[PDB]
Structures are given as C-alpha cells and as structure tokens.
Subunit: 280 residues, 4 copies
C-alpha cells in the first residue's frame, strides 16, 4: 500500500486508558492548566483511573465546567482552584487549598502556558515578559511552593512538565516560548538531581502537534497526535511503574523532530525512478 | 533520607500493560537469553506475544526459551545468531518469518563491552565491540527492514543503549562510540522509514541489578537511591513497543534513576554540604 | 613526567591577543556587565584590537572606572552607560545612547548575570525571579531592542551570549541560573534561525570555572581557564573570520563537562596495578 | 534586499587569521589530507609553519598535493599511503610519521566515505564500508598515536571533522550518520580519559561547503535553508580548525562546534517554515 495507508495501519491511535482500572486510587494529582486541551485530557485520564484531581488556572468559569464535566463522567472528584501561576501569593494560597481539600499531591503536572506566534521584532518587551512569567516563573513558583511543603511533610511526588520539541532546538516565531520552555527543562533536570533525596522525581514530555494543517507532511507517523495518547504517556510517567524514571525528557511527536532536523530528510519526496538516476 | 527514597521510589515489578494485550504479536529480541533481554522476553511472552530470541550460545538460548515458555504457556523460539555476520542474520530473519511471522516488535539488545583504559585495547578488541553493537544492530535492522518493506508491513523498533552513549565516557570507549552510532541510526530511520510504518525508539539504561562497596558507592550517585530492576525496564520497553505508543518515534528515554542528571550537573557535588554549613555560607 | 606536569606542559595558557593588531578597527561593541570579570576581559581585548566599546551595568562607579582604565591602557575610547537590563525603559534609553555616541553595534555581548549558590528550598520566589529577570529577560530586552534598531537601519551584527556548562545539563544548587541560562541558549538558536535574513548571527560560549583544588580534580586540562583565553574565543566568534558561524554553542571548560558527565569517569583514580587486577577478574 | 544584507554582513574572510609562523616547530598529521577539506587544512597549517604529514589511499593524488603545497609554502609536506581501516597499515603509518617528522602536536581525523541512498538499497558490505572508514579508521588512528604519545610522554590536540547530521541523525546517509556520531562520542570519551596525558579532543560539525546538481538549482535550494545565505568556504573551515589545534585553544577540550551558516538551527526549529509568511500575512494573523 501507499505511505498514507502504511502510516494509518501501523501508527493507528489507541485512545483508551492503558494503566489498570483504579491504579491511581488514593493518589492526589495537581494539574496547572487542567481546564483545557492537554491539561483537561490528562485530568480526565487520571480522574478516571481513580486519582483525586485538583486543577488550577485563571478562568474559574472554564475551570468549574471542566471539573464538573469530568467528575460526573468518572465518579471521582475534581476540584477547581483559581490561580495565576505567575503570582507567588495566589500560588501559595492555591497549594494551601490543594492540601486542605485533597492533601499533599503525589502527582504534579506543570502544564499552564502562554504562546504567541509572531515575528520576534513585532514583540514588545511586555509581550516577551508575559510568556516568561507564565511558563518559567509560573512553573518555578508552583514547584518551589509544593516542593517546600513536601519536604516539611516528608512526602515525595512525581513531577511532570509539558514542554515542546522546540524547547531543545529553539525556533524562530515562538522565541519567548522557546526560551521559557528550555528553562523549564533545565529546572526539571536540576531538581531531578537536587531533590531525589526528598522523594521527588522530575520528567518532561516534549509534544509535537496534537489534534485539539499540512505539518503532517513533516510527521513520519503521518498524522497529528491525540490528547488521549499524550495522557497515557503522562499517566505512565506519573505512575509507580515509573518510579525509577527521573530526569528523563521524552519526545511525543510522531517523529517530527528527527524528520525536520535531519539534513538530507528533504530528499524524502525523491521517487524510486529518480533514485535510480542519482545512483548512476 | 534513605527511608524517603525507599518509600517514594519503590519498585513496581508486575506487568503494567493489560493482560493478553500482545496476543497475535511477534517480537524478535537479540540477546534475548540473558539479563535485560530475558526480562523483556518474559514480559512480552506473559502478555501473549510470540517471541523469538537470538544470540550466539544455543544452550542458554534454548534453556531460557523453554523456561519462559513453561511459565507463560506461549511459545518462545530460540535461534542461533551472531549479529555481526550478515549471512547468519539473513538466515535468522528468514527462520523468524517462517516459524512466527514478520515481526511487529524488534528489540536490538545484543551487546559486548570492555571496561578498560583505552590504551590497553588492541585494534581487534575495539573492532569487536563496534561489530557487535553497531554493525550488528545495523545488519539486523537492514534485513528486517527490507523484508518488512517487501511484505508491506510495519513494526516498532527498540534499541537498548546506555546513558554514556549520549555523553561519551572514558574506559568504555568502543562501547560508547558504537552505542552512540546506534542512537544516530534510530533517529535516522525514524525519519526515513516512517513512510513504511516503522518507528524507532531508544532506552538509555543506568545500572540495573543484573566486598559490595562499589555497588554501595554507585547508589550514592543515584537520586532514586537504588539500582533499577529488570522488570521495571521491561515495562518501559513493552510500553514503547505497544500500540499505546504508536505516535512515539525517534524518542530517547533515560531509565537511570536520575543518575545522568546528577553526575552531569556542575554543582551537584554540593549535595554533600550540610545544613549547618549552608547557614555559614549564606552569611558569606 | 606525572599527570600534573603533562597537563602543565601540553595545556599551557597563551594569554596574549590572537587576532591581528587593529583587526576590530571600525567596529563597535556593546558589552553588558562589561565593567567586571569576564565582561571586562572581553572589553579589554576588543578595545586593544581597535573596537569602539560601550559597556553597561547598574553601578556607574565601577563602570566609569573600568572604562577609563581600559581607555588609557589601549588608547581607544570605552563609553560607560548605566543600565539595569531587567528594566526595558532603561534598555531603550541605553540602546539609543549607544547609537548616538558610538553608532549601531557590530558586536553585541550579553554577559550581565546574577547567581546564588543555594539549596533550592531556601529560595524565595523573589530570589528566583531576580535571576530570571537579569539573565533571561535582560538578555531578551537588550536583544529585542538592538535587533529592532538594526532591522530599521538595515544593518547586521554578531551576537554572543556567555552562558555556562550547566545551562545544557541543569544543576542543583544553581537552579534559577541554570533555567535562565538554558533560556538564553534557546533564544540564541531561535534568533540565529529567524534573523539571518537581517544579517544577525548568534552564538554561545559555555564556560567552566575561570580564574578550588577540589575543582581542578574534575578538569581534564588540570587548571582553571583564564579570562584572556576566554576573551580570545569570544573575539574570534565576534569577528569576520567567523562570519559563517551561527547557532553554535562552544564549551570552554577544559573538558570538565565531558569528565563529570561520563558514567565511568569515576574510574580515573584507578592505578595501573588495580587495572591489572580488574582485567584478570574479567 | 535579503541577499544584499547577507552578502554584506556574512562576507567570507578567506585569509589566514592566526599570526604568521605561529605553527613553526609543530607537526600535524592529517587523514584525507590530499583532497577537499583535508587539503585546505593542510595548506593553512603548512603556511603558518607546521610540518605536515598527510595520509590516505591514493599515493598519486597524495604526493601531488604534498608537492603542490610544499612549493607554495616552502614548508615540507610528507605523504604516506594508508588505508585507515587497516590496523597494520595504520601502525606502519604512525611509525613512519614519527621517523620522518616527529610525534605529532596536531592530529586531524578527516578521512571519510559516504553514500547518499535509501537505506533499503544498501548491502551489509556497503554499510560496513562506511563504518570501517569513518569510525574504525578514526579509532585505529587515535589508538595508535595515543599509545605512542603516552609512551613518549607527549601530548597533542586532536580534531575530528564530522557533520551536522552526526548529532541529529538523518535519513539517506544512515551509515555515515551512525559512524560520525560514534566519532563524536569517542572524542568526548577521550577528552575525559586522556586529558591526564596532555591530549585534548574537539569536533567540528560542518554544513555544506563549496567543495548530482547539473542545473545548479539544488545548490540554490540548499542556500534557502541557510540563515547566512551562502555555503561555507574551505579557508574559513581551515581557520576554525587551526584555532582549535592552536595553543590559543589549550583549554578547549570536549567541544563540538557547528560550522554551518546556521543551517542546523534553521531546519531543526519547528516553526521556522513560517519564514515564508509575508509582512501582509502577519498583519492578518496578529489581527485575530
Ligand atoms: N496542543 C498542542 O498541539 C501542543 C503542542 C506543543 C506543546 N504544547 C504544550 O502543552 C501544554 C498545553 O497546552 P494546550 O494546547 O492544552 O492549551 P493552551 O492553548 O496552551 O492553554 C494554556 C492553558 O494554561 C492556562 N494558563 C494560561 N495562563 C495561565 C496563568 N497565568 N496561570 C495559570 N494558568 C494559566 C490556561 O487556562 P486559563 O486561561 O484558565 O488561565 C490554559 O488552560 C502547553 O504547555 C503547551 O506549551 C501543546
Ligand atoms: N546491565 C546493566 O547495568 C546495563 C546498563 C546500561 C546498559 N545496558 C545495556 O543493556 C543490554 C543488555 O545487557 P545485559 O546486562 O542484559 O547483559 P549483557 O552481558 O550485556 O548481555 C549480552 C547479550 O548479548 C548477546 N551477544 C553478545 N554478542 C553477541 C553477538 N555477537 N551476536 C548475538 N548476540 C550477542 C549475549 O548472548 P550470547 O552470549 O549467547 O551471544 C547476551 O545475551 C546491553 O545492550 C547493554 O549495553 C545494561
Ligand atoms: N566567572 C566564572 O568562573 C564563570 C563561570 C561560569 C559562567 N560564567 C558566566 O560568565 C559571565 C561573566 O560573569 P563574571 O564572572 O564576570 O561576573 P558575574 O558576577 O557573573 O556578573 C555580574 C556582572 O553583571 C552585571 N549585572 C548584574 N546585574 C545586572 C543588571 N541587573 N543589569 C545590568 N548589569 C548587571 C554586574 O555589574 P553591576 O553590578 O554594575 O550591575 C557585573 O558586571 C556571566 O554571564 C556568568 O554567567 C562565568
Ligand atoms: N565538504 C562538505 O560539504 C562537508 C560537509 C559535511 C562534512 N564533511 C566532512 O569533512 C571531511 C572532509 O570531506 P571532503 O569533502 O574534503 O571529502 P570526502 O569525500 O568526505 O573525504 C574523502 C577523503 O578521505 C580519504 N579516504 C577515503 N577512504 C579512505 C581510507 N579508507 N583510508 C584513508 N583515507 C581515505 C580520501 O583520500 P583517498 O581517496 O586517497 O583514500 C579523501 O582524501 C569528511 O570527514 C566529511 O565527512 C564535509
């Protein structure tokens, strides 16, 4: 069969829960940006596997609707907490409330982000600072405060940051996002080293484009990723099956980064007949 | 301090994937008779995969194949193969297709290593490691790949390298070079062979439990406070070779308890500094 | 001869200017943090090679002194401008003065930084934010503003960011710095790609420890680096000899990163006779 | 325009950068020294006073190049015939190098082979050929010189020329990508292991250098993938190589330097394809 058909047959999405039913029972999970997109998918999966989930972002309206929607789907409680992660006080309140309504988290997912697609010369200083504040400082603030509380309580936890494939390579047009996300990965590798002694491990997923265009022509797997596939990976990394995975950075991108970064991968449209000619 | 690590990084050694979830799947595992390869074969077999294992020593291979087979009730086939010989590799792939079918899962795990000052290695010793690790994975991949293209079938490929493949390391230089070559190949074929339904990933393991003071010292370099287990490694490998990971391609996953981030961080040696010392140094 | 002597003989520092005399004549360089340490070293060399340098940091006192000190040493004028790089208004005023007194820069060195060595638990959100602000946002604010000006003027420039070896790997105890520095490296690689069309190139040096005994044992070259050595590498990367070097990250660390990062490098104190024993056992 | 800015601001400086005679008294051993990049590097080092020894398979081209450079610089270049994949030839070659010139201060591993081909069309032997020349050849040369240098209590600066795809991998050049990646891991390993012997090891990863494309349109399309807007030159590469092999770089060890006009960062960046978007198009995307 042709490319598209091989890709569809051999890279078909498996969009159901992977981990055993109720495997996350008795675990508390905290997800920033848990009300939409990737955060929402991860919450849905964790809740449905029995985790007690707490989600936090700026828009209380969307947050409550999502918490209520997942709650009635899974039977398990999702708590919503309004929080701007770039404000240390709201963060401190948020963690205080987190611990009151659920208890110390076993799973912390740093997923809240902001992004502008723009030529960099059209960005104001404030536009840049906004992305940096939400992504990097926001993740630092949440990690610092939860980290401090866990040390005091002598409990550990699994941390996961969702970054991006361009965090490692950089990219034009998404520059403050690229910088801030790169900062997030270094933080994770840093705290994986520093905080092992406290029972805290830190890992990263770098996603490519998830269905939530013909960037597909740049994806060896021949489709966009799905939220449910990403969530399975996240759940695995935040589970006890992955208790020895620490400091890891995992690409979830259908092969996109290796494709675009490989110098001669622009020969991929060259036909059989054209190859016969080149070899002569 | 070691109680927090023991409680919070406790190994979970049972099968993580759903029972019988690899039914109808065929897995080919080089170096399948021992260590990490055995543990991976065991897990895949217990989840219903039909496994084929291949390496040089037939007696160990047969014993392992028989021992797993009676534990799981699913058949494991042994094939004698020196992966550095293209003819033997050809016969092996052919036999694999004959007795089990085209593989859905390919695991390149066969390896050799010397721990030695590089200046003590002969050219032959160097070339041996390169042949087994790099050319062998290549030969296996090339041949399975050609058959899969012919048959219009795809597969998930997995190579076990090491944390020093990315960084290099003194004393394991030929291994470091060959394993790095293995990683570049996976990334290369993830891009080239996606169009054929083949995806390619890599696990970089740290020290796995395979006077006892060296072991104790090794742990001091590990944030998770213990060595890894074979069963944990196999859960990760089975995950990567499962349809749950059908959009995972070109990935490199450290399985090391945090060891690489610890040793590679410039100021991580400051972990030995005590709280009372920190109080003094913060005043300065 | 022993290890120490081999290292001494074969890795000896050459602390003199490498590039041809007056090869930076007609070039203007802007160096943040150029009043102390590595910044001062780099200014001294670029000035001594004929560049018109402009240095910028918070403390006018030290900045004015350094500028006069280098100027009298080299004969070429070094302008000081007071600037907190985390304050975008000051950055805007600073770049405007740079262009007024010297001209559009040909060389831009982002070197201003701050750091705390501390357990991460002991950091306040403010302490964290301060490092992030100086290092990442400061470098961004300076680059944004100068870049905008160079695009408007249709001129290009070579940019250089001084980071560190732990920016790529992370490190405990220096976590806000590691994060901000990694951010700076991603920025450089991003703008190397985006701004090539405008004649701007972006490179990075990752230094190890520059002029304790504990490190020297982790440095294959067996000594700390010198400021003059680092300055030669920086000068090369900001020169027309490196006009095709863009998006590069160069470790300047005596081999330290490869040493500490390599799993079996802890075996480096094993003696010949122990190696005899180890081999026999296998 | 864009071509005017790039031409003006990324203009090649193709003359020697290091001080005249700065390599007098030094000996340099270069594999593949007779052609292309190796030749260019040999020429510069000779011109700065180094005694060069070049080695590869074809004695005819090698001897010609050696003579041609010697006459241009007045400094002797020795040719030695050697297949780097043959450990016995390598041993004889190093022994000759030491007898005719001395223990090398500079070692440049530049000999290579490559196929551009769908991986499916490669025989085992074709794959093995690339691995043997690039990885094993570099190892054999390094192993033998290293052993001699240790025995003599001398050190040296080692340099390997790889490629931008050694770190990323790449379809269509898979044996070469793998072997070159092995070469990089080797440099990093020996930077750590052999520092104690006074040996340092660095790498340059070149992008496309001005020495399949009969019309000239593939080259033109390659340039569109390069921020600097041109291909690199041999003389520029040679300048970077000489810097890394000079005493000015005596504290540079385990480093990997891209020399690529920004190509690798351009192609690796997910959203860099947005460089095609015009000012007017951006005016609408930002207005939403
Ligand atoms: N979707 C993809 O194809 C893709 C690809 C690559 C990477 N990613 C990464 O994956 C993550 C998820 O992104 P997404 O696509 O699901 O949604 P998104 O468009 O990135 O939305 C960001 C989320 O973060 C929250 N947020 C924004 N500012 C906040 C703040 N100051 N404080 C607290 N929360 C804040 C938002 O909720 P509120 O508005 O209520 O504050 C929202 O839920 C991001 O980190 C992104 O970088 C996604
Ligand atoms: N164990 C660890 O702490 C650890 C840590 C990091 C990475 N790793 C990696 O994990 C993998 C598994 O190693 P292990 O610890 O299970 O034990 P091992 O001693 O590395 O196992 C070697 C395996 O490779 C096979 N083999 C060797 N030469 C072969 C050849 N030429 N052709 C075919 N097969 C060959 C052996 O079988 P035969 O003898 O029958 O040929 C044996 O099964 C290796 O790739 C290793 O590099 C292990
Ligand atoms: N020194 C080493 O062994 C080594 C090792 C690794 C990395 N590095 C890196 O190399 C670079 C050189 O640092 P260094 O060691 O020379 O001194 P440093 O302490 O790292 O840098 C301080 C410099 O930055 C300026 N600065 C601080 N905050 C500023 C702000 N808010 N706005 C403007 N300027 C500011 C300071 O001047 P004012 O006080 O007047 O503001 C001073 O000149 C740094 O980027 C550092 O990260 C150095
Ligand atoms: N030019 C570029 O655009 C570019 C780009 C990326 C990387 N590179 C790298 O830069 C280096 C130089 O490449 P190049 O373009 O000058 O030519 P090349 O085709 O890459 O290298 C051929 C050279 O290697 C020698 N050689 C081949 N097999 C040998 C063997 N078995 N033993 C000893 N020598 C052998 C050849 O001499 P004999 O025929 O006499 O044996 C010739 O001098 C290579 O390592 C290449 O990988 C170049």
């Amino acid at each position: 069969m042709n490319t598209e058909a091989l890709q569809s047959k051999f890279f078909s999405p498996l969009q159901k829960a992977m981990l055993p039913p109720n495997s996350f029972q008795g675990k508390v999970a905290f997800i920033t940006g848990g009300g939409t997109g990737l955060g929402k998918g991860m919450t849905t999966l964790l809740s449905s596997l029995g985790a007690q989930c707490v989600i936090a972002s700026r828009k209380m309206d969307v947050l409550k609707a999502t918490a209520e929607q997942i709650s009635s789907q899974t039977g398990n409680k999702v708590h919503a907490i309004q929080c701007d992660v770039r404000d240390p006080d709201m963060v401190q309140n948020t963690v205080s409330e987190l611990i009151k309504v659920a208890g110390h988290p076993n799973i912390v997912i740093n997923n809240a982000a902001g992004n502008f697609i723009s030529p960099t010369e059209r960005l104001s200083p404030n536009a840049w600072k906004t992305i940096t504040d939400i992504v990097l400082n926001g993740t630092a603030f949440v990690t610092l405060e939860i980290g401090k509380q866990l040390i005091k309580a002598q409990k550990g936890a699994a941390f996961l940051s969702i970054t991006t494939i361009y965090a490692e390579t950089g990219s034009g047009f998404v520059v403050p996002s690229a910088s801030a996300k790169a900062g997030v990965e270094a933080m994770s590798k840093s705290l994986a080293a520093e905080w092992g002694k406290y029972g805290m491990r830190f890992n990263v997923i770098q996603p490519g484009p998830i269905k939530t265009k013909e960037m597909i022509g740049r994806i060896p797997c021949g489709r966009l990723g799905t939220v449910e596939e990403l969530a399975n990976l996240a759940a695995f990394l935040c589970s006890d099956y992955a208790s020895w995975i620490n400091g890891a950075v995992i690409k979830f991108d259908g092969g996109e980064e290796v494709l675009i970064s490989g110098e001669f991968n622009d020969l991929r449209k060259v036909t059989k007949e054209q190859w016969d000619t080149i070899e002569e």
